[PDB]
Structure formats: structure tokens, C-alpha cells
Design a protein around this ligand. Structure first.
Ligand SMILES: COc1cc(NC2CN(CCCF)C2)ccc1[C@@H]1c2ccc3n[nH]cc3c2C[C@@H](C)N1CC1(F)CC1
Ligand SMILES: COc1cc(NC2CN(CCCF)C2)ccc1[C@@H]1c2ccc3n[nH]cc3c2C[C@@H](C)N1CC1(F)CC1
Lengths: 225, 234
């Protein structure tokens, strides 16, 4: 079914799969801010599983492969969502409508906050569209753990979906009135930002390991369907 | 005369990048001595240090890089040096399934990596295998290596963006001349750029390994290397 969707049907399915914007628990300390962020991330993860299951082609994968992809991508997925919703707030990170944090607001957190702010500002300068954002978030889910699977026809399937999402991005750009040349330049600029999201996630994982959703929780959440 | 980076045709970009290529270096060990007395970590460290000197010369020849201030050139090299070494390795290991061709006299398998290095070797092998399956071309490789240098880490900003746009145009030109349809051109471009996020990942895991053990090039050493280049013979 996934591979038969037109570029317009792909966009519609991705937009419809979008998770809701959650609120933080109703001045802060390092301890209170860290607690609020941890709590928010845990609640967003449950919605992220529902979203992942609705990304065309994701449920065609085995439970083990779905878990591997989520284990590799969950923090990148949270981070891209954050940078998207913080676009219209220069110098601030919109974690939630009731949790808009500046750079000044924990050891090791400042470098991560600065990188997220710079990423949000880069997407704002590129005028990233909602339809492009859902494509990029789906690419992160299918790509981040693709080159790290232990053991062939299934890997080809993920790549086919990734090619379908690229086609979808191009279609969006052609409908927005970009010339063929502008289309490949914009495609490249967006995909290069995914290397920075990977980087930020790696720095974030380092921070968490120095104080992490296990394969077991992810499997139970995916199985709970 | 001197070409400004943004004025280069796709053929002139390919030619400048191919001409800027560093040489393939050899590992520095006596072939008359048993491999048991060599130290794999020592050989890799020595090779990387020698490759880093050639990398400085290469970076200075990447169109648009010398248009940046010394401070900005250092920042880009500090963030990208390991990804640059890694992409070079995965390119030259393409024709050796299951092995990493560090040098013509240093072809290492997964078992030799078992002697935190095993996870990094496995990721490099998967990247090399993916580039082999995609039939990555020499001309595409030089473009990707230059993109890594300019896109590294996390108006002068517009210039980098425009030089990156020029390199993308160059990649597309190479793909169009190879006979790919506009759609196949976009798909191949996306597949190559998505591998770059995995190369970033491998470099982050590599840096973590180095920080866990003067083994990481400091901002100061790189600044000195770029500045010392001014004193080299032309
Ligand atoms: C202290 O901050 C965080 C803590 C966690 N740890 C939790 C998830 N883990 C799961 C355990 C049971 F499964 C425990 C996760 C994320 C964050 C926040 C966070 C929080 C909510 C976000 N929404 N959108 C983006 C969000 C982000 C992104 C960055 C700013 N950050 C992550 C990081 F880089 C430091 C590791
Ligand atoms: C022990 O292995 C390495 C050691 C170093 N440290 C050195 C550079 N530093 C400079 C001192 C001050 F400037 C000391 C650098 C690289 C490597 C090798 C290495 C080596 C030569 C390579 N050529 N092409 C790719 C190469 C690679 C890629 C991976 C396998 N890497 C391992 C890694 F990720 C942990 C760092």
C-alpha cells in the first residue's frame, strides 16, 4: 500500500499522522527544568510511537526492525519537532506552549541548547514548510538506524520508501514554483541539516549516558499497538 | 589568474577537486618485521597524523575555503577532520568487502578491530558496502568530501551556502552526464546526502572514543597547521 501513494496522498498521510502539541506539567531551578524536560519527552515518546506506526511503510517492517529504527531516531525526532515549533521564536526553544526557554535557562545543556537554536534559525531562514518538515521527520525515522541493522529485501524496502519521500519533497518544491535547479539545491540544503540533527542527538545521548529508552520499553510500546 | 568559487562551471569544479586530491599514503612499519610487534592503534594514529598534513593542503584548494577567515577555516577543519578521513577510507575500501584499506600495506578485517574500535569498524564497513552498491564515482566522491568540509559542525554564511549549492549543481551535472533522469538524479543525490548523516554519526562515535582515552587535534594545533601552510613551498 505505501509504495502506491501519489506525492499528494503521501503528504496528506504524513500531515494526518502528526502528533499533538503537548503541554509541560502545570521561576525554575536546574533540577525543576530537567524534570519538566524529562517528563515532556516521556509523554511525547508515547505519541511518537503512534505517529511512527502511521508513517507509510513502517508497519511493513518486523517488530525488531521497527524497534531498531526508533531506538536510533527517537532523540533526533524530538529534536526536529522542537526546532520546527521554535522557528518563530528567535533565541527561544518552544518545548511546549507553556514552556518557552531561552539560552540562559544545567552543565552540558548549554551546548545542546545553542545547537538547537542555531538549527531552528537555519530552518526559519530557509522558510521550511510544514509539508517539507513531515517529510524530513519521516526520513529521520527510516534512515537513522538503516545502516546499523545487524544482518536484505527489507533494507531495499526502506530505501524504496526513502526514494518515495525524496520524490514527495521534489513535488512539493515544484508545486511551490521552484525551478529544476532550485529544487535540487533546496533538497540538498534540507538533507544537509539532517547531519546537524544527527550530531545534536549524539551530543544529547552523551549527556544522558553521563547521568535512555531501552530496546525493551520501545518493543513493549510498539507491541501495545 | 584566479577563479572565484561561484563562477566555476560544473566541469571546472570537478577538475579543481580532482586536482586537489591528497595522495594515498602508506602505513609506516617495516615489512621485514612480524605484524605481532606493530601496534594497530599506533599505526592508525601515525597514518592519521600524516594524512592530516595533506588534508590542510587539500582544504586550502577546495573552492571557496580560502574566502573564509583563518578562524572560520579552523572551525570547519576542527569539526570535519575525522569525517574527511572516514569518507576517504570508505571510498578506498569499496573494492575490499569486509576489509578496511587504511593503506595499500594496511588492509584490516573486523577481527583485527576486535583487538570500542569494533563498533566503528562495522559502521565504516557498512558505509563502504553501501557506496560499492551505489557504484560511487571518483568525481562524486570529491564533491561529497568537499560538502563535508563546508557543512561541518553545528553575509559569510550565504557564501558557504552558495558554494555548497555550486557543489550540488556539480553532483547533478555528473549524474545527468551519467544518463540519469531528473527523478533518478534527485533520488541519488538524496541517497548520497543521507550517507553523510551516517558519516557524521561515525565521526561523533570516533571523537567519543578519542576523548575517552593530546589525541584530539585542538583548535590551536589546527590554527597553527593552517597558518604554517603559508610558509610551504608553492
Ligand atoms: C533533560 O532533557 C531531556 C531528557 C530526556 N530524557 C528522557 C527520555 N528518556 C526516556 C526514559 C524512559 F524511556 C528519559 C530526553 C530529552 C530531553 C531534552 C528534550 C526534552 C523534550 C523535548 N521535546 N522536543 C525536544 C525535546 C528535548 C530535546 C533536548 C533539549 N533534550 C534532550 C537531550 F539532548 C539531553 C538529551
Ligand atoms: C587509532 O585510530 C585513529 C587515531 C586517531 N588519532 C590521531 C589523530 N590525532 C592527532 C593528534 C593531534 F593532532 C591523533 C585518528 C584516527 C584514527 C582512526 C583512523 C586512522 C587513519 C585513517 N585514515 N582514514 C581513515 C582513518 C581512521 C578512521 C578511524 C578508524 N579512526 C578511529 C577513530 F574514529 C577513533 C578516531
Amino acid at each position: 500500500m505505501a509504495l502506491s501513494l501519489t506525492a499528494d496522498q503521501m503528504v496528506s498521510a504524513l500531515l494526518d499522522a502528526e502528533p499533538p502539541i503537548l503541554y509541560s506539567e502545570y521561576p525554575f531551578s536546574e533540577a525543576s527544568m530537567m524534570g519538566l524536560l524529562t517528563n515532556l519527552a516521556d509523554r511525547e515518546l508515547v505519541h511518537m510511537i503512534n505517529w511512527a506506526k502511521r508513517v507509510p511503510g513502517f508497519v511493513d517492517l518486523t517488530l525488531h526492525d521497527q524497534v531498531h529504527l526508533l531506538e536510533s531516531a527517537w532523540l533526533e525526532i524530538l529534536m526536529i519537532g522542537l526546532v520546527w515549533r521554535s522557528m518563530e521564536h528567535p533565541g527561544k526553544l518552544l518545548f511546549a506552549p507553556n514552556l518557552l526557554l531561552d539560552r540562559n535557562q544545567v552543565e552540558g545543556m548549554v551546548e545542546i541548547f545553542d545547537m538547537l537554536l542555531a538549527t531552528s534559525s537555519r530552518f526559519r531562514m530557509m522558510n521550511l514548510q510544514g509539508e517539507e518538515f513531515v517529510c524530513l521527520k519521516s526520513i529521520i525515522l527510516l534512515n537513522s538506524g538503516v545502516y546499523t541493522f545487524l544482518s536484505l529485501e527489507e533494507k531495499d524496502h526502506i530505501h524504496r520508501v526513502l526514494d518515495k519521500i525524496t520524490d514527495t519533497l521534489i513535488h512539493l518544491m515544484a508545486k511551490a514554483g521552484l525551478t529544476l535547479q532550485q529544487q535540487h539545491q533546496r533538497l540538498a540544503q534540507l538533507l544537509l541539516i539532517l547531519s546537524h540533527i544527527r550530531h545534536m542527538s549524539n551530543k544529547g545521548m552523551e549527556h544522558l549516558y553521563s547521568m535512555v529508552p531501552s530496546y525493551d520499553l520501545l518493543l513493549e510500546m510498539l507491541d501495545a499497538h
